[PDB]
Design a protein around this motif. Structure first.
Motif, PDB file in Angstrom:
ATOM      1  N   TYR A 122      46.905  55.925  24.728  1.00  0.00           N
ATOM      2  CA  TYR A 122      45.771  57.041  24.361  1.00  0.00           C
ATOM      3  C   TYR A 122      44.473  56.528  24.149  1.00  0.00           C
ATOM      4  O   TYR A 122      43.826  57.191  24.600  1.00  0.00           O
ATOM      5  N   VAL A 123      44.213  55.243  23.663  1.00  0.00           N
ATOM      6  CA  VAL A 123      42.807  54.312  23.715  1.00  0.00           C
ATOM      7  C   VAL A 123      42.252  54.541  25.160  1.00  0.00           C
ATOM      8  O   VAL A 123      41.216  54.745  25.540  1.00  0.00           O
ATOM      9  N   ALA A 124      43.308  54.174  26.237  1.00  0.00           N
ATOM     10  CA  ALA A 124      42.988  54.202  27.546  1.00  0.00           C
ATOM     11  C   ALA A 124      42.322  55.663  28.032  1.00  0.00           C
ATOM     12  O   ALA A 124      41.363  55.532  28.510  1.00  0.00           O
ATOM     13  N   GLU A 125      43.023  56.448  28.021  1.00  0.00           N
ATOM     14  CA  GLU A 125      42.799  57.822  28.203  1.00  0.00           C
ATOM     15  C   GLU A 125      41.315  58.539  27.705  1.00  0.00           C
ATOM     16  O   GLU A 125      40.537  59.009  28.283  1.00  0.00           O
ATOM     17  N   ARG A 126      41.383  58.583  26.411  1.00  0.00           N
ATOM     18  CA  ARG A 126      40.431  59.243  25.278  1.00  0.00           C
ATOM     19  C   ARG A 126      39.174  58.343  24.955  1.00  0.00           C
ATOM     20  O   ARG A 126      38.452  59.021  24.400  1.00  0.00           O
ATOM     21  N   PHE A 127      39.061  57.177  25.467  1.00  0.00           N
ATOM     22  CA  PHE A 127      38.021  56.311  25.074  1.00  0.00           C
ATOM     23  C   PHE A 127      36.491  56.983  25.438  1.00  0.00           C
ATOM     24  O   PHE A 127      35.711  57.166  24.667  1.00  0.00           O
ATOM     25  N   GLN A 128      36.452  56.974  27.067  1.00  0.00           N
ATOM     26  CA  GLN A 128      35.317  57.640  27.627  1.00  0.00           C
ATOM     27  C   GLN A 128      34.563  58.603  27.067  1.00  0.00           C
ATOM     28  O   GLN A 128      33.525  58.674  26.726  1.00  0.00           O
ATOM     29  N   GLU A 129      35.630  59.644  26.783  1.00  0.00           N
ATOM     30  CA  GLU A 129      35.128  60.855  26.073  1.00  0.00           C
ATOM     31  C   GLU A 129      34.853  60.916  24.524  1.00  0.00           C
ATOM     32  O   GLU A 129      34.272  61.780  24.124  1.00  0.00           O
ATOM     33  N   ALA A 130      35.084  59.896  23.719  1.00  0.00           N
ATOM     34  CA  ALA A 130      35.139  59.858  22.197  1.00  0.00           C
ATOM     35  C   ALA A 130      33.749  59.830  21.752  1.00  0.00           C
ATOM     36  O   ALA A 130      32.802  59.422  22.515  1.00  0.00           O
ATOM     37  N   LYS A 131      33.415  60.587  20.832  1.00  0.00           N
ATOM     38  CA  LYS A 131      32.073  60.998  20.035  1.00  0.00           C
ATOM     39  C   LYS A 131      31.745  59.366  19.521  1.00  0.00           C
ATOM     40  O   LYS A 131      32.374  58.951  18.634  1.00  0.00           O
ATOM     41  N   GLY A 132      30.398  58.909  19.704  1.00  0.00           N
ATOM     42  CA  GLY A 132      30.038  57.818  19.289  1.00  0.00           C
ATOM     43  C   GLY A 132      28.840  56.998  20.005  1.00  0.00           C
ATOM     44  O   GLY A 132      28.990  57.249  21.312  1.00  0.00           O
ATOM     45  N   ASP A 133      28.102  56.261  19.453  1.00  0.00           N
ATOM     46  CA  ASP A 133      27.025  55.614  20.065  1.00  0.00           C
ATOM     47  C   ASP A 133      27.605  54.277  20.735  1.00  0.00           C
ATOM     48  O   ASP A 133      27.701  54.692  21.841  1.00  0.00           O
TER      49      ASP A 133
END
Length: 197
Positions: A122-133
């Motif tokens: 999940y972290v591998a797939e969804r990291f790039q796109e996650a909201k945050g600085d």
DNA sequence: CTGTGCAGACATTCAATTGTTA
DNA sequence: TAACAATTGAATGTCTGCACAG
């Protein structure tokens, strides 16, 4: 912190020679590599007469005496808690180094990665796109979404995780087979979850 | 494990999760 | 079965490896 302020032990006869000579050699051969300069510097030390090598020891020996005195003085001026703090700092520093060394050995012997969890996928797939600085804030985001996942959505990941569990077991079987062959039976698992120990 | 200079390796930080181990 | 380490990611550190001897 306590250890930070702690008096340092003197370096040896050869290491003194080395530290003073290096600037001199670096000034004369600016585009030469440090490693070669050291090989040349060692040579100079080796060639150096024992009478000249004595001058360096005599100083180190003298310097040891100052250290003994500085250390005693430093410790005398510390409180029980600071002492324990200092003991803990040193222990921790040792264990950290022993740890790092074990890891490097393994990495060098090319040990397979551990099986990636559904959450890892999940972290591998969804990291790039996650909201945050910061990547720290981005993780916090992924972590939060993960918590709110329908076991229906979570399943996709759980299957990839089951797929990696297969690779792991396989890669491990091979790597361990290789380890026995290079005579490193010590690096084998004592207990295997999905196979005979 | 110390000194050096640098290149490149690796630990920390935010979390959860899990095989292996004690 | 708890605790430990290592995974997913990256920015931002810090630390090692090499060439050596003590």
């Amino acid at each position: 912190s306590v250890l930070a302020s702690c008096p340092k032990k003197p370096v040896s006869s050869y290491l003194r020679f080395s530290k003073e000579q290096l600037p001199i050699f670096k000034a004369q051969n600016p585009d030469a590599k440090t490693t070669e300069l050291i090989r040349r510097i060692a040579q100079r030390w080796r060639e150096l007469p024992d009478s000249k090598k004595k001058i360096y020891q005599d100083a180190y020996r003298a310097e040891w005496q100052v250290y003994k005195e500085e250390i005693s003085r430093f410790k005398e001026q510390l409180t029980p808690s600071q002492i324990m703090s200092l003991e803990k700092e040193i222990m921790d520093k040792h264990l950290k180094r022993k740890a790092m060394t074990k890891k490097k050995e393994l990495t060098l012997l090319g040990k397979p990665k551990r099986p990636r969890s559904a959450y890892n996928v999940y972290v591998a797939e969804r990291f790039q796109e996650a909201k945050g600085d910061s990547p720290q804030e981005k993780l916090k985001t992924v972590k939060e979404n993960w918590k709110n996942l329908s076991d229906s959505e979570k399943e996709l990941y759980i299957q990839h995780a089951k797929e990696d569990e297969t690779r792991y077991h396989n890669e491990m079987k091979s790597w361990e087979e290789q380890m026995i062959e290079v005579g490193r039976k010590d690096l084998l698992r004592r207990t295997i979850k999905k196979q005979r120990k």
